[PDB]
Design a protein that fits this description.
This is part of a larger assembly, with 1 copy of chain A (437 residues), 2 copies of chain B (252 residues) and 2 copies of chain D (291 residues).
Chain A lengths: L1 E5 L9 E7 L5 E8 L6 H4 L7 H7 L6 H16 L5 H26 L21 H23 L8 E2 L2 E2 L5 H34 L2 E4 L2 E4 L19 E3 L12 E4 L9 E2 L18 E2 L1 H4 L4 E4 L8 H9 L6 H10 L1 H14 L15 E11 L2 E10 L2 E8 L1 H12 L8 H6 L5 H5 L1
Antiparallel strand pairs in A: 1-2, 2-3, 4-5, 6-7, 8-13, 9-12, 10-11, 13-14, 14-15
Chain B lengths: L2 E7 L5 H7 L3 H9 L1 E5 L12 E7 L2 E2 L3 H13 E7 H6 L19 E2 L9 E3 L6 H16 L2 H20 L7 H7 L9 H5 L5 E4 L2 E4 L9 H5 L7 H4 L2 H12 L2
Parallel strand pairs in B: 1-2, 1-3, 3-5, 5-7
Antiparallel strand pairs in B: 4-6, 8-9
Chain D lengths: L1 E3 L3 E3 L1 E7 L2 H4 L7 H12 L4 E7 L6 E6 L2 H5 L27 E5 L1 H12 L7 H4 E7 L7 H11 L7 E7 L2 E6 L4 E5 H4 L20 E4 L8 E5 L2 H12 L3 E5 L7 H23 L13
Parallel strand pairs in D: 4-6, 6-7, 7-11
Antiparallel strand pairs in D: 1-2, 3-12, 3-13, 4-5, 8-9, 9-10, 11-12
The chains are: A alpha+beta (437), B alpha/beta (252), D alpha+beta (291).
The structure holds flavin-adenine dinucleotide (2 copies), iron/sulfur cluster (8 copies) and fe (iii) ion.
Amino acid sequence: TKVVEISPTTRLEGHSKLTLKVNDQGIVERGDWLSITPVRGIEKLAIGKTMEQVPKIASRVCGICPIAHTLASTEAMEASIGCEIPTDAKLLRIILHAANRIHSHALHNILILPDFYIPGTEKKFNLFANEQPARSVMARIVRIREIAQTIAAIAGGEAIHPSNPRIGGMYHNVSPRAKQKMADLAKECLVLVHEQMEFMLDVIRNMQNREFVEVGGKQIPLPKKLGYHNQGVMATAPMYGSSSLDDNPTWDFTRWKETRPWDWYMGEVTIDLEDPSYPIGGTTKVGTKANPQMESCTGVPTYDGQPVEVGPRARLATFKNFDEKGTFAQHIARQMEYPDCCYTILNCLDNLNTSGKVLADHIPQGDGSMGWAANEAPRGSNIHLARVKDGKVRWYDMLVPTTWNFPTCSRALTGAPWQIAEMVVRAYDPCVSCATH
Amino acid sequence: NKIKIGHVHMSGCTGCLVSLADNNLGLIKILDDYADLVYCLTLADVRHIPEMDVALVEGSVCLQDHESVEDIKETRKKSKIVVALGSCACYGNITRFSRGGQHNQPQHESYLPIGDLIDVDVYIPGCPPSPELIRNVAVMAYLLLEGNEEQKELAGKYLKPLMDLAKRGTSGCFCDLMYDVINQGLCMGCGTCAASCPVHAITLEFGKPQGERDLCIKCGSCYGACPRSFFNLDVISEFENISEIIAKALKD
Amino acid sequence: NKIKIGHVHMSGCTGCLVSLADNNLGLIKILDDYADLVYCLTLADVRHIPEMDVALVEGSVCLQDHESVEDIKETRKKSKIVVALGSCACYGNITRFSRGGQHNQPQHESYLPIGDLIDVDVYIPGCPPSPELIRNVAVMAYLLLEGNEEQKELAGKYLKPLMDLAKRGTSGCFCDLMYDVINQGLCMGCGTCAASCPVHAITLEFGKPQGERDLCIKCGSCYGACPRSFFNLDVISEFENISEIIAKALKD
Amino acid sequence: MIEDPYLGKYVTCVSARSTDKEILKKAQDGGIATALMVYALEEGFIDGTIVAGEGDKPWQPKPVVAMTREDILKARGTRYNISPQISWLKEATRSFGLDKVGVTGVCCQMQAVRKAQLYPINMRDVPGKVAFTVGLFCMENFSYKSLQSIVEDHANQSLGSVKKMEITKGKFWVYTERGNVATVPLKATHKYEQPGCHVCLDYVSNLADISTGSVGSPDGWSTVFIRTKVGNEIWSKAVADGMFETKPIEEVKPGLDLLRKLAKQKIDKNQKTVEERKTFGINKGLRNPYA
Amino acid sequence: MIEDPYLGKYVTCVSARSTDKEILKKAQDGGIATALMVYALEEGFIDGTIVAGEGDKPWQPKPVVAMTREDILKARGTRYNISPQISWLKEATRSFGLDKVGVTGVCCQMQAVRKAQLYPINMRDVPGKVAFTVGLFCMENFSYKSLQSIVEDHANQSLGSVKKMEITKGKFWVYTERGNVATVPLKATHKYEQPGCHVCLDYVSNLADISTGSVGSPDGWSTVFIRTKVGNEIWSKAVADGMFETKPIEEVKPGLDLLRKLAKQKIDKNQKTVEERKTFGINKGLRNPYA
Ligand SMILES: Cc1cc2nc3c(=O)[nH]c(=O)nc-3n(C[C@H](O)[C@H](O)[C@H](O)COP(=O)(O)OP(=O)(O)OC[C@H]3O[C@@H](n4cnc5c(N)ncnc54)[C@H](O)[C@@H]3O)c2cc1C
Ligand SMILES: Cc1cc2nc3c(=O)[nH]c(=O)nc-3n(C[C@H](O)[C@H](O)[C@H](O)COP(=O)(O)OP(=O)(O)OC[C@H]3O[C@@H](n4cnc5c(N)ncnc54)[C@H](O)[C@@H]3O)c2cc1C
Ligand code: SF4
Ligand code: SF4
Ligand code: SF4
Ligand code: SF4
Ligand code: SF4
Ligand code: SF4
Ligand code: SF4
Ligand code: SF4
Ligand SMILES: [Fe+3]
């Protein structure tokens, strides 16, 4: 056993590292992927603040998925106080949610493609480069994300940190013109995401037929079971979410418990294996001490006493019994989620009444009861829990998808050549600012 | 010659980077012709901070995180121009409210905008910051370093109010409109602050700003956008020409 | 020789004067032995601002009221030591919220603390300011101008943090505890800010301040009272001796 | 281009009034601001515009995004108190889903728009979606309590009866629906001006695409500056389409000579105020937004 | 008077413990802080005192104004997380109507009281109504989440079972009600310290009337500094009344030599931190409250 460390990780959101024990062949025996993002402490600073402010603060946990936290936080407040929002407010929230999932999955295409090969060649995608096919692909992705952000801005008030959601529904309904504009854009987007999806699935399928990849000049073998783990999955909806107001909620808070990294991470180790050629800048210096239990910045939520995988694959496994697992299965399931986003937007626009009410007539102030809301963020189940009393948050808790995925991905690192541990990581589409909040 | 640009991610949400990317083909145009992205953990595999002409720095600094403090000091050392990108970097924003006590780093208690630890050349305020502003600053930074004298003169005039904001301080709030506009005899009731506020904390009552201070997330946008904070007539009166210049620089 | 003291009433509520008077026989002792009240429209018939050793100035300045602006300029001209008495004079306080529009002077819109118009030597923050603080400042001002060198040295050391506050700025808010204490790594959870807040806007959650910003009336008390704003060990460690000195100066 | 130091940059200046007789019935002057926005909407230069609609109290304006000819016409007539027009500038591009926003307002509001186009600070999508701005001349404005005090006390009129107000020929004029007229000397109104107007160095909405006002033209007519390429395209095409009567401004009394003089008095007086701010205190001064 | 540079100003220093056997049953050490406040209340030196009462979560302190012997005794035992004692300092003189307030707490809380006596900033009536302060020795403190992490993870104990906690001999000690003992090396606890403690230059509550702690005295006994005239009057009279066993501190191991050394390490380490703040940045630093 030797210990190699990659710090920082790259082509994901935010700040983490991989602390890896490897065998004499460089295959991970036990690896820890951990947040080293400072804890801004949103759960504790929320206490005493107003139920209107806390969702707008929680939004600023993450600018890729602020819709997830805005909606999950707002709907946790609504669940605690017992506020039923109007239909047209819900329809606008779903449109906002679906649009953001498009932009997020497409942004993630940008981050993972450099690890992938132009099918049938030994050339990797370089999306910066003004050459084909990369530039044509970048142009499609860029238009996809532009459409997505535009719809999000129209239905949510703002693409990043949406302003329209409020306790009890929305500040604004949209105009007949705005509704036509969103429909026009969704029609254009649906064709584009079908193209991007088929493109990505082909690239992934080419990856599954490869035997090695090139990292830092060297050939790295591709295990058949790359990224396999035995944690199973958790998901609350295929699209939107669930909350404790529902007749039959699809998440069970009696099965959840959160520990410190303590229960699940390695203690102190010393780095004795270093590779200065790891692109670009090498790995952690020999002699460095690391302690994942103490350095990890997240809590570890569990379901039935164990870490779980959340995210697109978790959703398709839970709701369609999708039956492939590991790194390339995760990539596949994410791409498959493209069309539902556009069909959902178009169906929601069809049902939206632009003269309809968007704010509940009565917003109660709460008595301290616990409520919770789950939003199926692009990366998986985002669960916010709250006690609101007299309009103030007395208790707040956030179980964010990448928080769930950190210990699970770690276990999935077993069997990988340490030089492609980052590829295992990127199939989770990590958001480490999310994970840490 | 392309200038060298890095994106440095401190205690931010990456929404500032998303805002840059939301210039769409404008960003690709800039990366094609005017600028090399030498560093960005989100998009590229350069692991350590290299030399930069322009560092776009987002997020604030956790005083109790050693690597973070070293990163922001190293960034100033490595960069000709330091840009506080977005309100967290400029003004602390939601991290003003951080107070520790959360797992798994309950000692991660104190956060300051980057201007309290290093000297900052340029503020780009906003939460989220507007894509167009980030684009204008990138283009003008290039013109300031690779243009003819007529361009470098324009660029210097364009950036001056954003440099003045960096010298003014590291605090942003609804109160800026009281302290420095209404209380100064300068408010004329235009309502711009209300449009810019990302959380709808500002209403106008009889033509005057009314701030919901317990909704305000201290981003500094409203004073920035207010036309009685800075109003540099030499630049803004030439809006048609400066707009045409920026468009031409992005054209295909 | 008694020093000469005036009370100047700008846009204040006179509660600062009431606080002075609430030293009871202490005030009469001071007026008997150490100080002549040369000016105070509330208590005496001197119609115009005379020369003063110490001007206790309460309230802020309405920029659209000509006599008010002349009064505060005349006060600085007429006074050796200018004291911003209370939070309106120090920090604007509730007049930060003024925005015009009320009969019969709808143009009376803009109010600034006095330190934005003249140089201020000494802050006495608080709304209301504590009688004991106003007494201590009067006594120490006398010692600074009529004492032996040992007294003038003590007085100068006592007043230094109140002079530092005057040089720090003209703004007061719950946010001071964020910006300059919690965000600086200095908060240790003592809870003093909560006791000093006059409107109960501060609670402590898990040992850390939580501010109801839409209750806060921007008086600057909490940062003042915080033992991690200024803590001048040379003075405060001698609390027993300095207390005995002040008592003896008020004794009969 | 003319680069006048008091009237701003412009291509031409004419005296004009709308040929739409319905618009003229309630227009303040020539109906230029209504006629241009209606026409821009019908032609597709804008898909909506911010106008000073009717509010919750008599003669109090309420900004609104108008998207029909009818809603635009509801904003005819001068309201001499504050209308925070720019408060709907971003929202017009969000829930309203507009691609081509029009904006009407006074000089400082035109300034706000151009600052947002060039320095968007939490104003995403606004720079590229501003399509057409029409700026009113403005000497000064008032709070609503000021306007109440002027009309009810000094003019002795009930606000519920007022059909039109007009500042001209040294007086504040009040016209009632039943046909009476009252005047107030402007000297009496000065205490009531919004203080932030005293620092304003822009009289004829220098930064608008098209600027329009009353001074320089007879009653029923407007003085119009056509300034930007946007402004010239729309004006040319509207004139060609029969939307306006025009006269070159030099053939009109009092014309551009009176106008340039009042512009000069405004800037001169306010530049002085701007300067006195620097030494307002003892050893210190007040902020200058223009520094 | 002794003017020690690390132990502050004091008249004498003894090793002591209360003769009240009921108090000792749950006291952390010698029962000095409880015994003094109970005695001051019975004798009329105070009519109430601020103590670290029991809170809403196990081992979380809640400050409270205690006005009976029974309520004072509820605050026995060290809670190693933050108790914002000073938050009730003014209120004790308002709705509670006290004339003679007692205050218990650690060094920084003693500091807060004296600052309020000398620089009352919206602390009316407080300077004259503080009657008696008892200060605990304090090396450092923790947030509640820190304490949870230390006890539940590192010591592997349930908080609901803990009877006593103790930092001593290089370890964090946890004693359970059913009789078990667990320890954690203090090196493991350092990441969890409240950051604001790292700037604290006061170990034995220099500014209290009487200071009390554990280091220097055997188990069951306290090291006590009697510092002010208030402190000497109350201590003398309590000793004379039979309230305490004492031993001169020089006849006690480890005694004042160990104590002065730990005090020196604390100030030395924290003075260094205070100094590094000045150059924390590049060309700038962090605030120093002591400057
Ligand atoms: C405070 C104010 C001061 C003015 N001072 C002068 C002056 O000194 N000299 C001069 O020649 N003209 C001045 N004007 C302009 C003049 O009064 C007419 O408004 C202008 O000629 C437009 O008339 P019109 O027939 O073209 O517009 P109309 O067709 O009658 O349409 C009215 C237009 O004015 C806008 N509007 C009405 N009230 C306000 C308001 N409070 N704020 C913002 N927009 C408003 C509406 O949105 C609409 O665009 C002033 C206008 C205002 C609001
Ligand atoms: C964070 C903390 C750190 C300490 N570090 C040291 C040290 O390094 N060396 C040393 O010798 N002693 C230290 N002490 C003091 C020691 O642990 C005992 O508290 C002290 O000896 C008093 O014991 P006693 O028997 O006289 O009090 P008891 O009769 O048991 O009464 C307990 C007293 O302690 C107060 N108290 C209990 N917890 C807190 C709290 N969190 N905050 C404020 N007041 C509290 C109560 O109000 C009460 O006055 C520390 C105490 C605390 C709270
Ligand atoms: S300024 Fe706003 S969008 Fe930018 S890093 Fe901070 S929270 Fe994110
Ligand atoms: S944006 Fe307009 S309304 Fe708001 S403070 Fe500035 S001048 Fe006043
Ligand atoms: S009021 Fe709104 S725009 Fe102004 S600082 Fe607060 S959140 Fe930002
Ligand atoms: S500081 Fe408070 S008490 Fe003093 S004049 Fe102002 S409102 Fe009155
Ligand atoms: S008074 Fe005490 S609790 Fe309040 S900010 Fe200061 S150190 Fe923190
Ligand atoms: S929180 Fe309270 S003490 Fe602090 S400035 Fe506001 S009102 Fe004053
Ligand atoms: S005078 Fe200037 S600041 Fe006042 S309303 Fe008219 S255009 Fe605006
Ligand atoms: S070490 Fe100092 S600041 Fe920390 S709790 Fe103890 S006495 Fe207070
Ligand atoms: Fe969490």
